[PDB]
């Protein structure tokens, strides 16, 4: 048996390779981005935004974020999904974005995911898997984003209930807002200190 | 074959989150321990990227950004295999790489190193592994990069790489170095890795028989990702 | 002190003239043995080069040919001492060096290697050692050079050097390499040298404490020339 | 005690570093060349020319040559000269040149050297020390150039007489010629084969 | 897969052309070095031999020449695999073998050794490797052969073999010996090979589990040929 | 990675295994020989003959020779040929022969090959690849046979021009002759000494 | 010679700021990493102390505080050289030392150890290094000091020392011990130093040939400070 | 090359050797102290005072402090100063003091330093280099003291701007005050915790 | 620098007075132990010999006694340095040497060995060390000397030497031998020396690079004398 290749930080210039556009590099015709909603994508459009703060309470202006989620019916656009259901044919389920060099804000245009089956016939509350990479971070940090308007589902969520420190569970719940006619979930990540965001080893 | 969950990541084969020798990690590392969870469909699934979206020069860093001429530097080919810990090949995995140029200069706005920019070099590429988990790209060997950890810190020559494969749990980003580089033994970032055998797992080996005469040198570099266990009894994943 | 002749050159510390592994030496090597002679004034004397003739950038290969900008490549400083076999420093010796650029391309009409030319790099410099036999120049680390000995032959990265000192008998031209370069162990030219200790005498060592932060790396390389014996009895040189 | 730094071939592109001009590289203001005769240099001007042939009888078109000689009175412009005599103040005594890339001919414009003292109160016949470097040559080859119009001096020369194979001595004697009003000594060097030039270990 | 050229032959893994210890090589070895060339279609192609032309006993040296009875000697089976340097099997390659009889006598007009001729033994066979690069023939173990290099020279027992495969560049003729033969350590021909590991690459190993009871012994012998590199960028072969 | 099986001399009795007939051994029904021309083979028939001389100028009477060539249209009867053209279906392209035990002469009955594509869109002059094995020869010697009636093609041939010693190129050109109505190319090989034949490492 | 900046301090050759084994360091160590800066005139300069200010007994701890008689204890002379990392001597550097008496008692108000005070011993001295970087003082060998880290902690015998030299960047305060002291292997303070070779760099060696008969013993102790690199190209210090 | 002698804590009784007077030890005639202002010293007199707090917010009553600064014209009384300007002949530029055993306050009587040249033709804002030693501190901690009445100079200071966490820069700025007719700059140092003082590796 | 006394002679680095293996020492060795004394001016002072008194051939044993011709034997040059135990050179020290001739015959009335006398060889020379403590003389290599300790005793080839330097306490007389001489391992006189390292301190080393072609061989031999300690406190010498 072989050992997993060891992780290393994404580095300060991580944008060159994963978000060329943000680094003013036009080399690829098709660029991967933070927009998971296509023309015929099903579900309610939502905007996921926030910031990432270090131990001093300062936003990281060089962090890279990616998300992985199921479609509106809780089916993953992945061959590994064994639900036997047909997935939204116009949904990649993944996206990537970088914090703004000036303000530090990041965001994704996506769809609110449907409930996904849990282990042993349970049901997971709607959630988006999120990972962050950046200078100073030796291994990508895994976390989940739940929605505050799904209070009843969250209370019965297996993963949230596997966190024995009930106080920390709230750090995984994004807050709903409505700029105009658009739904926006605010999710700030705190890597260190008080209200430190929960990170998982998946 | 009915697949179960990915084998547990071995935390001792990876650098810890908090590593004082690597300064910027002091404020960007959680003080709380990671919460381990049992996997679900969310962790065992991952996106699929169609080959149709890839340009013909996406894996050729020597030419995908060349304008007036060729990039200045050492022509080198890098290839290898991507397997899971159980030796199974990883098919159609997305491999993205990026690096500095021959001067050790990154084409990034936040890089003000006096090393000279190369108008014909971009520094990024990507590709999908084939059915045997094989991958291959061409580039210019990057020069070491001076940085500010301790005032006179220098990263050995290195190429950044990222993989998105079959399971989200396999998501991995790392760096590989070139055999013989003396800076390897003094780098604080490479030293965050606990064992010597794991550090050597990040070194690309010179592959002399695969050099192309009067053209390019070649380095061999294999990547190992986490693997799934098969299930033969209860299947609680669902 | 009344000086006598230079100590006998030790032929076993040098490559032989005929070395089949290095193809071009087969027709350019005498079949007759060298005729050893007792030294005279002709062999113990040598020319003197005044410092007045040297330009200010003669020992700076990064800038002595820069036109529109800086050369592309790894900024490195090389320094060391020139001594005679008896440990005495060699003062005011003429040291000339030349090399290929970061692509492994020489700025020479007979070089058609596809490696890219650098409009801001010339590849040659020179300097005189000081009273302590110390020398120092700046350059771009050269890339390996593919050549035709066997079809897929590759010279490790190298810098050519030449010295003219106090005695014609000390006239020497050679090459030095960089610590860690894997091509060193497979080069036919370096293998013409009989002993392993002598091969290592041509390797420039990384000198980390003398790196200049956010600027250049540094290699240490010392050179040893033949030395004169002193005379205390008959002086037959004349 | 330390060992002499081991020799290595000058390489195929040896011109870049030792004769930039010949390689079309203008980087130095003052370039070293094959002209040892200055305006006020004493002695009879002479031209030394020839070719270098390999084992096949073909001229090397990438060879580099240097010479070292005394002035017209047999004094070397070197602090190591212990003759106590004053040397020609307008004579470096050294020069460098490369074979022509096309024809293979090389040449120097210099002065015919005067006799130099030998060992144990002997007198050496007039001569020019010459060394050649080039691809394929692992160590610079040392030889001497004597003049055929100095037959009487050559017969008594210590170095020439130290060659027990009398037949090989002639390979070190250049032939005098006279293009117009100029004196030219032709000296061809044969590295291998018949009439192979004598090379010394000095 | 688009194939490029065969990897460069490693001259250090083969005997030199000039080997004074092997007398007849003194006048039959070029004085000039071999001229290395870049491969073309001529070097990467080779003939094809149809199996239809092979008789049923072509690989059975015990019976393909038997007239009145069986050959006298040690019944032995020899088998193994033919692969290229990259481990790929060599399919349908022509393998031809020849040898002396049990007395160490060759059925050749120029052989006057007093060793006795065997009217029922010819000494030659041939066969094509299968899809796995496997080959197998049967023969009589040859006896050592006394010859005139130095007056009392003796070749250890040996079987000559020749291969014509996929590329002309792979053309190879050699000899293999039998494990344990003491003459192996004193043979001038085997000593022309520079390294000890390569000399051992010519020794057939006893394969006891594959002996056929009350019938024949068995030796295992694998052959490695030069291999082609695959091309992923420019294809200049044409 | 594995190392190539080391070469060894073909030995003095090399005929037993590669040319049984010449050794008076009838064991094979179908014997490989030096006749590459079949009934329906296309192209002009030619006879290739010569001798192999050792360092003393004496012919080897125990040498074995093989040739590999393209058909009349410059296509190789090999699956490795990527020209996309159809090859002469009645041409093996290979042959083997041995020098005569008495005189030393060898010969092949074949066809004059057509031009074959070179590297980087170049065109190779017509040629036959030839290799020799024999006692005293540790590794088969590779060489090429060009034709003197193809002067214009030879001048532009990539391989011939890769030999920097122009004088040696002629050693690879066979001379055309005409016994009666047959074309014969004489090609003598000199392993050592003057006019030593060029040998390649392919 | 135009001097540049002091070589980077090697953090791995020094104890970390946070060392739990040394209790009081838990609350007196920054949680943030040190910010490395490029040197300026502020860091490369330092004060000068004139010898005129030093009393004749400033380097003689046996007599500079003696009132009614001599101090009780082992008469020992300590001497050595102060050099910079590049081997250059450190001239006219201010060396200040202090220690406990023969009982292991410090003449300090906060010291209530039952070890007996010596009315004729003060415990402090100072001196300037000469042109060779040499220094020498005389004292009483200090006794071990019991302290409260863990309840039964004991410092091996030690002398505190401080140096102010040519550059502020060289400012250093440390402690040296005496060869053979068994407490050396169990001291938590000495163990804050990562490597064994560095720990031994703090041990004064017995120098028997320099003992003064019927008078005093002698220990040799050399000190190495950070050194400046010389500049041969751009000089950005200003 | 040699390694730097490893650092060790100054120890709890550090006063004996560096400030004998404070330990009631009169052994030296000339004692080094915290008064850098002499009779003919140029510049405006200022008093620098403060305290040092540990991780609990408690002042260290056994800490030793030293400062190094330029004169009023920004010239260092050091042979290493290459400004070519003449320095104030009545200024050592260095001083040493210890915290009070009871209260914990420390102070220096000095002069406000003039601007000093930075690297690459820049100008550093006026500052005093300060280092602290004490029990529990394994290596002297380096920091700088800037003045709040030099806001414009501080904003352009190279060293202050090399601190990417803008929030921490204020920890290096002392506050001006005026007891009576005297100028006093208050500078408190916090080794650990919130508002932790910035420390440099010089 | 104010000098004190010479360091104590280390009796363990010298042969004892009583050594039964060396017969004549049995009656010429004190039975009482040596009385050690503290040095005074008498022990730290010594005479000065002006160079004006030395003839031009005093250090040339090949010519200082030659009458009709040259001595018969091996022409050898011997040179080296005289230092004190602290490495300081010993300037203007008187070095006197004497030896037997090439036959192993001493030009002394009490020598009746059948080895042949050389009318052109005397066997004695002398010289003063220069400012670097360097010395050099020329001689004929002495042949071994048969003597009567045990009946068949043989001294290895040896040269006797004596030194008078700066202090009477340094007065020393000894013998040195030549590298490789087999008699060295069986000589009773050399065995009176307790340690092996000290025995080797008496062996002159072949110095091949300093051989003078077609003339003389050369041996290197350094001598170490006792050294003075410097005084920094009380000076009781007076
Ligand atoms: C690198 N970032
Ligand atoms: C770069 N890391
Ligand atoms: C990258 N540094
Ligand atoms: C250079 N080759
Ligand atoms: C390289 N010549
Ligand atoms: C290049 N030699
Ligand atoms: C076979 N001999
Ligand atoms: C065997 N021949
Ligand atoms: C047989 N050879
Ligand atoms: C101290 N203790
Ligand atoms: C100790 N103090
Ligand atoms: C004490 N320290
Ligand atoms: C001497 N004997
Ligand atoms: Fe990087
Ligand atoms: Fe080169
Ligand atoms: Fe055989
Ligand atoms: Fe203490």
User: Six-digit token pair at G176?
Assistant: 């040296």
User: CB–CB of F87/F77 below 8 Å?
Assistant: yes
R_g (Cα) of chain C, nearest Å: 19
- Tell me phi and psi for residue D187, to 5 degrees: -135, 100
Cα-based distances in Å from H117 to B213, G36, H78: 54, 19, 15
How far the first Cα of chain I sits from its last, in Å, is: 16
D13 CB less than 6 Å from ligand 5?
Answer: yes
User: Six-digit token pair at I233?
Assistant: 């406190």
Other CB atoms within 10 A of residue A5 CB: 25
C135 is in an annotated binding site: no
User: Six-digit token pair at E129?
Assistant: 């490797």
**Discontinuities in chain F (C→N > 2.5 Å), after residue:** none
User: Six-digit token pair at D83?
Assistant: 């003759």
d(CA E93, CA E47): 10
Total number of domains constituting chain F:
1
- At residue E225, the 3 state secondary structure works out as strand
> What is the structure's resolution, reported in angstroms to one decimal?
2.2
* Secondary structure in 3-state letters for E85-131: CCCCECCCCEEEEEECCCCCCCCCCCCCCCCCCCCCCCCEEEEECCC
d(CA C84, CA C89): 6
R_g (Cα) of chain B, nearest Å: 19
d(CA B194, CA G154): 33
- At residue D150, the 3 state secondary structure works out as helix
Half-sphere exposure of E235 (CA within 13 A, CB side): 11
Q: How far is CA C100 from the centre of its chain?
A: 14
| CA-based nearest distance D154→chain C, Å | 16
User: CB–CB of F146/F127 below 8 Å?
Assistant: yes
Q: Is C155 a catalytic residue?
A: yes
d(CA H18, CA B87): 65
Strands H141-147 and G203-206: unpaired
Domain range enclosing D60 = 1-202
- At residue B104, the 3 state secondary structure works out as coil
Does residue A127 come out as left (phi exceeding 0), alpha (psi in the -120 to 50 range) or beta?
A: beta
B155 CB less than 6 Å from ligand 2?
Answer: yes
Instruction: For tokens 């009645």, name the residue.
Output: F90
User: CB–CB of B179/B206 below 8 Å?
Assistant: yes
Catalytic residue among B106, B135, B177, B219: B106
Does residue E147 come out as left (phi exceeding 0), alpha (psi in the -120 to 50 range) or beta?
A: beta
Strands B158-164 and B94-99: antiparallel
Other CB atoms within 10 A of residue F140 CB: 20
Strands C124-128 and C94-99: antiparallel
Q: Which of G61, G65, G199, G55 is nearest to G128 (CA)?
A: G55
Q: Chain C: residue nearest I78 by CA?
A: C232
* Secondary structure in 3-state letters for F59-110: ECCCCEEEEECCCCCCCCCCCCCCCCCCCCCCCCCEEEEECCCCCCCEEEEE
Other CB atoms within 10 A of residue B203 CB: 17
> E7 touching B, CB under 8 A?
yes
Q: How far is CA B162 from the centre of its chain?
A: 5
Q: Which of F5, F118, F132, F130 is nearest to F60 (CA)?
A: F132
DSSP H33-73: -SB---TT--S-EEEEEE-EE-TTSPBPSS-EEEEE---TT
Cβ-based neighbours of G216, under 8 Å, separated by 6 or more: G75, G76, G77, G138
d(CA C98, CA D12): 12
User: CB–CB of F28/F20 below 8 Å?
Assistant: yes
d(CA B173, CA B15): 13
Does residue C181 come out as left (phi exceeding 0), alpha (psi in the -120 to 50 range) or beta?
A: beta
| I85–G213 CB contact, under 8 Å | no
d(CA B76, CA B217): 5
User: Six-digit token pair at C85?
Assistant: 């076999």
Cβ-based neighbours of F99, under 8 Å, separated by 6 or more: F51, F52, F59, F60, F61, F62, F63, F64, F65, F105, F106
Cβ-based neighbours of B184, under 8 Å, separated by 6 or more: B156, B177, B190, B199, B203
User: Six-digit token pair at D3?
Assistant: 């060992």
Cβ-based neighbours of G220, under 8 Å, separated by 6 or more: G78, G79, G80, G204, G205, G206, G207, G210
| C229–I210 CB contact, under 8 Å | yes
- Maximal CA-CA distance, chain A: 55
| H11 Cα nearest atom in ligand 10 | 1
Strands I134-140 and I75-84: antiparallel
| E38–B212 CB contact, under 8 Å | no
User: Six-digit token pair at G198?
Assistant: 């560095």
- At residue F17, the 3 state secondary structure works out as helix
Nearest alpha carbon, ligand 6 atom 2: D11
| CA-based nearest distance C34→chain E, Å | 21
Cα-based distances in Å from D92 to C43, D71, D110: 16, 9, 10
d(CA F107, CA I134): 80
d(CA G80, CA G93): 13
- At residue E199, the 3 state secondary structure works out as helix
Task: Give the residues across from F151 on adjacent strands.
Answer: none
User: Six-digit token pair at D41?
Assistant: 């240099």
d(CA E91, CA E130): 6
Cα-based distances in Å from C62 to B105, C76, C135, D22: 16, 9, 17, 21
User: CB–CB of D101/D31 below 8 Å?
Assistant: no
User: Six-digit token pair at C56?
Assistant: 């200010």
Q: Chain G residues with CB inside 8 Å of B19's CB?
A: none
Instruction: For tokens 């990507």, name the residue.
Output: B126
d(CA F15, CA F4): 25
User: Six-digit token pair at A173?
Assistant: 């719940």
d(CA C114, CA B75): 9
Q: In residues, how long is chain I?
A: 238
d(CA D18, CA D33): 9
User: Six-digit token pair at F120?
Assistant: 């980087």
Q: How far is CA B80 from the centre of its chain?
A: 12
d(CA D67, CA D183): 18
* Secondary structure in 3-state letters for chain C: CEEEEECCCCHHHCCCCCCCCCHHHCCCCCCCCCEECCCCHHHHCCCCCCHHHCCCCCCECCCCCCCCCCCCCCEEEEEEEEEECCCCECCCCEEEEEECCCCCCCCCCCCCCCCCCCCCCCCEEEEECCCCCEEEEEEECCCCEEECCCCCEEECCEEEEEEECCCHHHCEEEEEEECCCHHHHHCCCHHHCCCHHHHHCCEEEECHHHCECCCEEEEECCEEECCEEEECCCCCCC
CATH of the domain at H37: 2.60.130.10
User: CB–CB of B97/B125 below 8 Å?
Assistant: yes
| CA-based nearest distance I179→chain C, Å | 21
User: CB–CB of F63/F202 below 8 Å?
Assistant: no
Helices (H), chain B: 41-44, 196-200
| B100 Cα nearest atom in ligand 3 | 1
- At residue A48, the 3 state secondary structure works out as strand
Q: How far is CA F156 from the centre of its chain?
A: 21
All partners of chain G with 3 or more CB pairs under 8 angstroms: B, C, H, I
Cβ-based neighbours of F158, under 8 Å, separated by 6 or more: E40, F118, F119, F122, F124
Q: Chain D: residue nearest F164 by CA?
A: D58
User: CB–CB of H39/H84 below 8 Å?
Assistant: no
A11 CB less than 6 Å from ligand 2?
Answer: yes
Nearest alpha carbon, ligand 9 atom 1: F11
> G2 touching B, CB under 8 A?
no
d(CA I10, CA I85): 11
User: CB–CB of F49/E9 below 8 Å?
Assistant: no
User: CB–CB of H125/H154 below 8 Å?
Assistant: yes
Task: Give the residues across from G173 on adjacent strands.
Answer: G162
Q: How many helices (H) does chain A have, and how many strands (E)?
A: 4, 13
> B37 touching G, CB under 8 A?
no
User: CB–CB of B16/B28 below 8 Å?
Assistant: no
User: Six-digit token pair at F197?
Assistant: 């034949």
Other CB atoms within 10 A of residue B60 CB: 20
Cα-based distances in Å from I184 to D160, G172, I179, I220: 46, 54, 9, 17
Domain boundaries, chain E: 1-238
User: CB–CB of B202/B177 below 8 Å?
Assistant: yes
| G229–C212 CB contact, under 8 Å | yes
- Technique employed here was X-ray
CATH (residue range E1-238)? 2.60.130.10
Instruction: For tokens 């072989």, name the residue.
Output: A2
d(CA E51, CA E40): 28
User: CB–CB of H135/G110 below 8 Å?
Assistant: no
> C151 touching E, CB under 8 A?
yes
d(CA C176, CA C221): 8
User: CB–CB of A191/A50 below 8 Å?
Assistant: no
């Amino acid at each position: 048996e072989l050992k997993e290749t060891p992780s290393q930080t994404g580095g300060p210039y991580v944008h060159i390779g994963l978000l060329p556009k943000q680094a003013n590099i036009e080399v690829f015709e098709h660029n991967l981005d933070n927009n998971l909603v296509q023309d015929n994508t099903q579900g309610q459009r939502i905007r996921l935004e926030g910031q990432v703060f270090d131990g001093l309470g300062l936003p990281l202006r060089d962090v890279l974020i990616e998300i992985w989620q199921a479609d509106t019916n809780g089916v993953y656009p992945s061959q590994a999904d064994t639900q036997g259901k047909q997935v939204d044919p116009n949904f990649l389920g993944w996206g990537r974005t970088g914090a703004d060099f000036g303000t530090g804000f990041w965001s994704f245009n996506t769809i609110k995911p449907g409930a996904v089956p849990g282990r042993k016939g349970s049901t997971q509350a709607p959630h988006i898997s999120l990972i962050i990479f950046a200078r100073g971070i030796n291994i990508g940090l895994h976390t989940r984003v739940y929605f505050d308007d799904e209070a009843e589902a969250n209370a019965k969520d297996p993963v949230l209930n596997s966190i024995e420190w009930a106080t920390r569970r709230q750090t995984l719940v994004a807050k709903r807002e409505e700029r105009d006619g658009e739904v926006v979930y605010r999710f700030d990540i705190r890597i260190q200190g008080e209200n430190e965001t929960v990170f998982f080893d998946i | 074959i009915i697949w179960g969950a990915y084998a547990q990541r071995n935390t001792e084969d990876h650098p810890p989150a908090y590593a004082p020798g690597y300064k910027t990690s002091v404020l960007r590392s959680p003080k709380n321990a990671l919460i381990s969870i049992a996997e679900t469909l969310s962790e065992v699934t991952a996106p699929h990227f169609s080959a149709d979206k890839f340009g013909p020069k996406d894996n050729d860093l020597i030419l995908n950004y060349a304008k007036d001429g060729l990039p200045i530097g050492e022509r080198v080919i890098v290839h290898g295999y991507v397997r899971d810990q159980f030796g199974r090949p990883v098919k159609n995995a997305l491999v993205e790489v990026w690096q500095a140029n021959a001067s050790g200069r990154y084409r990034h706005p936040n890089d003000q190193y006096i090393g000279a920019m190369d108008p014909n070099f971009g520094g990024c590429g990507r590709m999908l592994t084939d059915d045997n988990g094989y991958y291959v790209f061409r580039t210019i060997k990057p020069g070491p990069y001076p940085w500010r950890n301790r005032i006179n810190e220098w990263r050995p020559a290195h190429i950044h790489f990222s993989l998105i494969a079959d399971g989200w749990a396999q998501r991995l980003i790392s760096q590989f170095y070139f055999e013989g580089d003396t800076l390897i033994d003094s780098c604080p970032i490479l030293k965050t890795i606990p064992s010597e055998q794991q550090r050597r797992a990040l070194i690309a080996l010179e592959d002399k028989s695969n050099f192309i005469e009067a053209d390019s040198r070649c380095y061999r570099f294999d990547i190992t990702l986490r693997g799934r266990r098969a299930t033969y009894f209860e299947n609680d994943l669902t």
